[model samples]
Target: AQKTFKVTADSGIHARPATVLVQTASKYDADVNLEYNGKTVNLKSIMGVVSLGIAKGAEITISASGADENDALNALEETMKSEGLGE
Candidate 1:
């Protein structure tokens, strides 16, 4: 399963925000990947995600498979809006 959202934060997805994403994904048992700019990386990895340097206008995808994939995607979607990181 997967869920995508455009970043709404003007500052973009930097270290701090990326950390939140990483932590959230880590709580899941599913294999989750973050897709952006035609590239995909492990959502639980801070290095890969921050290196992508996702900007405000970019779209991010939380793609997961395996057990709890749907729950993980749903949790990430909620995190996006609650964190004010995306719409």
Candidate 2:
């Protein structure tokens, strides 16, 4: 399953946090994707997600599925919350 949230952080999901998300995502075996503009990009790919120029106020969908998928979702959500990024 997936969850949608609008980014509210002034920094947006820029290089710094994009790297954070991608690298942190590696600890999971779940398939996590970054969805935006109706496109799905592997969250583990450093360049792809930020390539979209995702910015504040942009609505983003994060999809996680596979073994430990649920926990991966929670992990990513908490990452956003801790970063002051998503709703």
Candidate 3:
């Protein structure tokens, strides 16, 4: 499954937010990825996420697949919403 979200945090998905994201994504057995600018990176990797340079207002697609894909997506979406990362 997949979903798109805009970066809404004032500071964008920098180190701290990326760390939080990685933590969230790592919780599930599903493989998670964040795609932007035609580039996709593993959401569980801090280096991969940081390298994307996701800034405020940037739109990104999150994709997940595995036994717990839906749960992974839901948790990530909620994290984005509650963490001030995106709507």
Candidate 4:
């Protein structure tokens, strides 16, 4: 499953936020990925998340699949909101 979100953080998804995302994704057994500007990368990989260069107001799509997909996605959605990464 997948959903799109708009970044709401002023600083964007830089190292700190990206690291949070990676840490969150790492807790799940599902596969998660983030897509932006027509490119997709593993959400658990700091390099991949940072490589996207997602900035404030940017749009990104997150996809999750596997055993804990729903749980992982839901947690990530909440994390994004609470972390001010996106809306």
Among all candidates shown, the one with the greatest lDDT = 3
TM-score per candidate, in order?
0.91, 0.90, 0.92, 0.91
Candidate 4 accuracy as lDDT = 0.82
Best of the two (1, 3) by TM-score: 3
By lDDT, rank the candidates, best first: 3, 1, 4, 2
What 10-residue stretch in candidate 1 is worst by lDDT? 49-58
**Candidate 4 lDDT, 1-87, residue by residue in tens:** 777878878888778888888888799989988888898888887877677777877888889898888778888889888856787
State the TM-score for model 3: 0.92
Task: Name the TM-score of candidate 1.
Answer: 0.91
RMSD of 2: 1.2
* Whole-model alpha-carbon lDDT for candidate 1: 0.82
Worst 10 residues of 2 by lDDT: 46-55
Misplaced by over 4 Å in model 4 are none
- In the range 1-87, model 2's lDDT, one tens digit per residue, is 678877887877777778888876688889988888888988888677677877777898888888887777778788887868787
Local distance difference test scores for all models: 0.82, 0.81, 0.83, 0.82
lDDT of 1 by residue, 1-87 (tens): 987778878878878787888888789989988888888888888778777887777787778898999888888778887868886
